[PDB]
Amino acid sequence: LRNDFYRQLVGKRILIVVNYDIDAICASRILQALFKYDHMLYTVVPIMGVTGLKRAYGEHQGDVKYVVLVNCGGCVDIVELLQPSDDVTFFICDSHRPLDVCNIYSDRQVCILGDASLEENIPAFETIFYDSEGEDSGAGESDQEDQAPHEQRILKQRARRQWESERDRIMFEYTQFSYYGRSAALMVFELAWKLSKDNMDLLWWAIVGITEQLLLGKIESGAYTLELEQIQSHVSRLTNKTNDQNTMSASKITFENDLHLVLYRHWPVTESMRYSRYSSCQLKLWTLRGEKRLHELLLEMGLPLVHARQTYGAMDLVLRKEFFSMVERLAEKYDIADIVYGTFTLSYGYRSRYAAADYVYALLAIMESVKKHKTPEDCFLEASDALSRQHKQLLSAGIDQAKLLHAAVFRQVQSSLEARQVHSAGSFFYYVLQEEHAFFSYPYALGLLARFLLRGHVATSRARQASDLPLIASCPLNASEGMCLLVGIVPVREDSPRNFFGKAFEQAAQKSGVALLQDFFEPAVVQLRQSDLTRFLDSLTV
Amino acid sequence: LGPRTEIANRFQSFLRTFVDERGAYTYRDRIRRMCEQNMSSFVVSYTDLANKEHVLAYFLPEAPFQMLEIFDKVAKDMVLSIFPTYERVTTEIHVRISELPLIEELRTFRKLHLNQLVRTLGVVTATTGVLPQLSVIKYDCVKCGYVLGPFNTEIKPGSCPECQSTGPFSINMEQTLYRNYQKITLQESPGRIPAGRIPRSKDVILLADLCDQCKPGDELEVTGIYTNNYDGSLNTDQGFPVFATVIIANHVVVKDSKQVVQSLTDE
Numbered sequence: 001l002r003n004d005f006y007r008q009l010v011g012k013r014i015l016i017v018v019n020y021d022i023d024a025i026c027a028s029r030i031l032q033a034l035f036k037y038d039h040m041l042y043t044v045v046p047i048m049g050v051t052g053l054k055r056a057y058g059e060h061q062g063d064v065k066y067v068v069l070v071n072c073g074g075c076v077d078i079v080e081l082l083q084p085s086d087d088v089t090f091f092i093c094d095s096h097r098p099l100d101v102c103n104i105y106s107d108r109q110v111c112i113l114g115d116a117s118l119e120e121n122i123p124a125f126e127t128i129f130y131d132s133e134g135e136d137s138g139a140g141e142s143d144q145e146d147q148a149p150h151e152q153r154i155l156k157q158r159a160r161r162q163w164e165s166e167r168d169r170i171m172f173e174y175t176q177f178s179y180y181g182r183s184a185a186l187m188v189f190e191l192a193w194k195l196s197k198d199n200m201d202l203l204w205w206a207i208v209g210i211t212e213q214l215l216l217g218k219i220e221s222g223a224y225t226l227e228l229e230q231i232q233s234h235v236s237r238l239t240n241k242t243n244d245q246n247t248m249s250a251s252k253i254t255f256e257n258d259l260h261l262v263l264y265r266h267w268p269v270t271e272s273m274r275y276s277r278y279s280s281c282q283l284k285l286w287t288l289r290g291e292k293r294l295h296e297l298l299l300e301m302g303l304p305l306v307h308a309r310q311t312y313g314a315m316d317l318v319l320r321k322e323f324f325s326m327v328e329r330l331a332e333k334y335d336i337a338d339i340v341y342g343t344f345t346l347s348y349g350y351r352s353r354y355a356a357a358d359y360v361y362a363l364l365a366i367m368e369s370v371k372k373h374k375t376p377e378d379c380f381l382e383a384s385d386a387l388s389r390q391h392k393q394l395l396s397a398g399i400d401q402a403k404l405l406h407a408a409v410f411r412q413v414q415s416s417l418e419a420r421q422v423h424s425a426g427s428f429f430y431y432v433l434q435e436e437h438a439f440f441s442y443p444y445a446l447g448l449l450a451r452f453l454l455r456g457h458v459a460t461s462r463a464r465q466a467s468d469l470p471l472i473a474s475c476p477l478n479a480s481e482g483m484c485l486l487v488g489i490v491p492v493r494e495d496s497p498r499n500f501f502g503k504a505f506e507q508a509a510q511k512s513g514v515a516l517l518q519d520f521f522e523p524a525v526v527q528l529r530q531s532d533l534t535r536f537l538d539s540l541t542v
Numbered sequence: 543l544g545p546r547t548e549i550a551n552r553f554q555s556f557l558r559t560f561v562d563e564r565g566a567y568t569y570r571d572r573i574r575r576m577c578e579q580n581m582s583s584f585v586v587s588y589t590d591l592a593n594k595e596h597v598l599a600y601f602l603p604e605a606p607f608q609m610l611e612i613f614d615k616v617a618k619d620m621v622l623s624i625f626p627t628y629e630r631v632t633t634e635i636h637v638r639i640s641e642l643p644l645i646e647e648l649r650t651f652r653k654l655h656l657n658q659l660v661r662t663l664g665v666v667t668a669t670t671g672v673l674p675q676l677s678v679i680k681y682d683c684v685k686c687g688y689v690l691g692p693f694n695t696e697i698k699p700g701s702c703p704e705c706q707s708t709g710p711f712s713i714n715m716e717q718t719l720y721r722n723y724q725k726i727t728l729q730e731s732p733g734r735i736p737a738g739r740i741p742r743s744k745d746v747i748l749l750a751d752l753c754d755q756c757k758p759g760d761e762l763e764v765t766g767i768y769t770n771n772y773d774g775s776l777n778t779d780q781g782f783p784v785f786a787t788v789i790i791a792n793h794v795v796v797k798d799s800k801q802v803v804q805s806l807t808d809e
Contacts, residue, residue, distance in 0.1 A: 295578050295579075296578060298578075299574070299577065299578050299625065300627075301627065302625055302626075302627025302628050302630070304580065304630060304631050305579075305580050306580075
């Protein structure tokens with residue numbers, strides 16, 4: 001709620017955007033445009049890690065007043081992290097919600113965006129700093145010698161009894177599981193919508209923001225079949241032209257019920273039915289048989305084979321219009337059910353009609369971990385200079401790069417699987433890897449690696465005993481002399497039951513502890529030494 | 543007709559009545575096996591025909607053209623009815639035979655072998671390349687500017703959109719169907735000769751589904767059927783009418799088999 005605070009925002013500021021994301025750029029370019037509206041100059045920021053943030057504030061170590069960070073907050077008791085913070089205006093708006101309340105209270109230098117149907121931590125502070133044992137609050141925080149306005153020292157006994165019996169819920173917070181919550185800038189759309197901004201491109205940008213982690217398999221939407229009311233209610237109800245829409249530029253954007261198979265639009269088919277997980281794994285194509293069952297479905301559709309190696313755009317007409325008009329009904333009965341989802345589309349003009357999510361699979365492929373040593377931040381500056389209507393020579397290069405990665409992905413999966421590199425190693429499953437790729441250096445592509453092997457093996461070689469068990473993976477960086485990256489990932493098909501691994505790896509860190517890092521605001525990640533994991537893995541079993 | 547309908551109907555009550563290989567007979571599934579891959583070269587077993595209904599050896603030679611045509615109608619009315627989406631790619635079919643209890647060597651066939659079932663082999667030599675043909679009779683009327691309609695022999699009826707008139711005509715280079723074509727020269731092997739003389743030879747025609755399959759200098763197996771060029775200019779003659787000979791190709795088997803080859807048992 002800043003229909004009241006936004007009228008504070010005229011003077012100088014700093015607009016930070018914590019570590020790379022599509023929520024990031026989407027929620028921030030809009031604010032760039034907003035703040036060049038009422039004549040203020042401002043600052044956009046790259047974060048490569050929390051050290052980059054602390055040196056950034058060090059680099060911005062002034063008394064700048066309206067300082068902002070978005071999509072972060074769970075790092076420290078940020079008053080403790082931040083010394084010169086005395087009365088400065090801070091702002092969070094983060095969807096990684098499970099944050100401690102030391103950051104929430106002290107109502108001078110934070111903004112409590114607390115609003116949810118979960119009144120779950122109301123007394124959560126009434127004993128941590130308010131009470132203490134082995135240390136005048138008139139509590140355990142103060143003296144405990146029968147001086148606080150069955151024995152003289154059962155004071156501490158009741159104190160710790162309450163403390164620990166409700167650490168049953170403190171250990172529930174930040175020590176069992178993590179997630180994200182709500183949108184990144186849909187709140188910001190409805191904020192700005194009071195100020196008469198009918199920027200259709202802003203709607204597209206927020207659609208990009210949601211359809212990243214609308215991936216109901218990756219991160220939950222929840223609002224989805226409710227936003228089929230909500231977002232249309234934003235846009236559809238207010239029609240500027242009931243009769244004049246046969247226009248060239250930026251025709252008022254639309255919504256249709258289509259699919260999430262990869263790049264149906266810009267490529268041929270029979271390679272693009274091959275690289276997604278949900279279509280592939282449920283048809284098992286890395287074995288020979290899957291091509292045959294695929295072929296016998298192509299029979300029932302009776303598309304030509306020659307056509308199925310032509311670009312969908314390049315086909316003749318009637319098939320390429322009737323395609324999805326067929327596929328939605330005679331795919332439900334042949335092992336695959338749930339690729340059809342709710343998304344948008346629009347053209348600028350005559351060139352072709354871009355697909356409302358097909359940018360994000362180019363954006364994820366704009367993470368070029370090149371050896372030039374500069375390119376992450378340049379990738380950011382390219383990305384946010386991409387989402388417009390203007391810069392478009394580069395989006396095609398993005399698509400090309402994306403597809404060649406996505407068809408390099410499988411190339412390792414067949415290699416790894418039928419050699420049976422699926423090491424069980426006890427309570428969970430376990431994977432190991434040997435040398436570097438420019439493909440899968442960084443971890444986004446690494447989770448994409450894991451989330452094809454996982455479905456493949458765990459669905460197809462077992463009974464139903466072990467189909468619900470979690471995942472890990474190595475990933476070496478010949479970049480930095482040997483660090484042996486790792487990421488934690490969840491078991492099958494439990495949308496709300498998300499990661500144990502917000503901290504869970506730290507068990508072995510607690511036991512032995514070896515050079516571990518958590519440099520990212522991302523929890524679902526760790527960083528190590530080159531080969532000092534084996535005994536740490538023997539620890540990290542349980 | 544009553545009996546002359548039963549041929550296709552016996553094919554229909556064949557391809558789901560005769561069984562081998564412990565159930566799920568091939569032609570129940572061979573035809574869809576081939577409609578998947580977009581091949582349009584279904585093949586028949588003769589020995590299976592002798593196992594099911596031996597009637598189809600005497601009924602054939604009186605005009606095997608009509609036998610093959612009454613074959614192909616069945617594949618059409620099966621496939622394009624059961625895969626109605628199929629009617630896009632080729633929309634035409636014919637069948638093949640690969641089981642004949644006889645290998646007729648060259649220099650063994652005469653006028654008695656006219657227009658009937660054959661098997662023969664030999665070796666390829668030089669022949670033509672690859673060319674297409676015509677398939678249908680359609681003209682363009684030139685008096686009144688209409689088209690005569692759709693219709694080795696000419697037809698030319700007087701009935702047409704031009705008040706059934708315009709004996710004259712002209713022709714377009716489109717809206718009429720075409721057909722691939724190629725020739726061959728069959729010579730006999732230099733093993734099974736009469737031990738040191740010239741060899742003998744015949745020409746052979748193969749058709750559109752069968753091209754870029756053969757090659758100069760190859761081993762061969764063909765069913766074929768004996769042709770008769772109907773007139774090499776009958777007139778005042780030589781000491782012989784100038785008459786000629788070809789065989790028309792139904793189905794080849796190659797003997798080298800340089801591909802992934804054999805069909806598959808069920809178990």
